[PDB]
């Protein structure tokens, strides 16, 4: 057989681990992470569990309002587990696909979180599968066989036996876990009971919500059997200085130079709406400033971009107020 998302788009490239260290004591500056000491400490406890081997059969859940850094914590724990650990970051809505049934999608997600090291090259098992499966647009052109995966599993067993490969349990992140129904939760519960099983992090921003596929309401829309085997970590919303530092490091990452008044107005904008909308505004502001032959982004550019592109709350409220007639 032949051999060799979040990183490609960005928005999480600056986080090189949790950075707490000092024997499980959160550091304010740390390795990219800013604030949220309690969630980071709980995550570090989770790493300690994984390293000692006391996580088998359990899983991690992260709650909080959107824009608080659940994916940041997941990426931090992925980085802290090792230099080349796999990290998949799927959503709850990506298991409803026209081509792949929920079983195939969830299996693909799981095999995208079981890395193999070859002597050093680290490759995902599902990447190995896709390599052993037969135009510059093939992403247009799933269902990657049923026997090829068995053959690759046998070959991986052989590669473990004679010593040419090493198995690395990665991290699988499911954003908005309330999207999954009781069908997929059973698959998750059954799949966790394996020796080669990735750590499973779920994220949610919803409280009491009806389980999809059933009629009974449960916390976070998760069945009780799984909910009693979860380490729930709560993330508090950011404050002014934390988001200011986040914007600063992000701008340093995407090569944007900005003034202080623009920084504070951007921080206030992000405080009102979201970290993601404020982050989105940065590239548009930089491109607007380039047209006006300006090197440093002023605050009036922030004015222009905030007037041009709308946030979600305003966009929804405007047209809800439209339907009054």
């Amino acid at each position: 057989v032949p051999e060799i998302r979040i990183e490609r788009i960005g928005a999480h490239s600056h986080i090189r681990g949790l950075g707490l260290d000092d024997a499980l004591e959160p550091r304010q500056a740390s390795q990219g992470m800013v604030g949220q000491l309690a969630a980071r400490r709980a995550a570090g406890v989770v790493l300690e569990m994984i390293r000692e081997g006391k996580i088998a059969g359990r899983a991690v859940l992260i709650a909080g309002q959107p824009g608080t850094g659940k994916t940041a914590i997941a990426m931090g724990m992925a980085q802290a587990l090792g230099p080349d650990t796999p990290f998949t970051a799927i959503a709850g809505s990506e298991i409803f696909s026209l081509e792949m049934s929920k079983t195939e999608a969830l299996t693909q997600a799981f095999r995208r979180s079981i890395g193999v090291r070859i002597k050093v090259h680290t490759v995902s098992l599902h990447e190995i599968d896709v390599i052993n499966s037969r135009g510059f647009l093939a992403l247009f052109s799933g269902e990657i066989k049923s026997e090829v995966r068995e053959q690759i599993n046998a070959k991986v067993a052989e590669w473990r036996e004679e010593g040419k490969a090493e198995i690395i349990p990665g991290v699988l992140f499911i954003d908005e876990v309330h999207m999954l129904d009781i069908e997929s939760f059973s698959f998750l519960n059954r799949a966790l009971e394996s020796d080669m099983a990735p750590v499973l992090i779920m994220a949610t921003n919803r409280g009491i919500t009806r389980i999809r596929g059933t009629s009974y309401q449960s916390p976070h829309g998760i069945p009780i059997d799984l909910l009693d085997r979860l380490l729930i970590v709560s993330t508090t919303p950011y404050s002014e200085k934390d988001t200011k530092q986040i914007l600063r490091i992000r701008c340093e990452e995407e090569d944007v130079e900005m003034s202080e008044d623009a920084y504070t107005v951007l921080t206030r904008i992000g405080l009102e709406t979201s970290l993601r909308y404020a982050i989105q505004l940065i590239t548009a502001a930089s491109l607007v400033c380039r047209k006006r032959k300006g090197t440093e982004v002023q605050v009036d550019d922030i004015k222009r971009v905030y007037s041009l592109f709308l946030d979600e709350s305003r966009s929804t409220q405007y047209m809800k107020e439209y339907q009054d007639a």
Binding site: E272, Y306, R314, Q317
Partner: peptide, 23 residues
């Protein structure tokens, strides 16, 4: 009025009030 305040409209008249006193 609802939440329609932007930079231009607020200056013309001179939920989204305290946020509006930063631009």
């Amino acid at each position: 009025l609802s939440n329609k305040l932007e930079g231009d409209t607020f200056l013309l008249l001179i939920e989204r009030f305290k946020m509006m006193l930063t631009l």
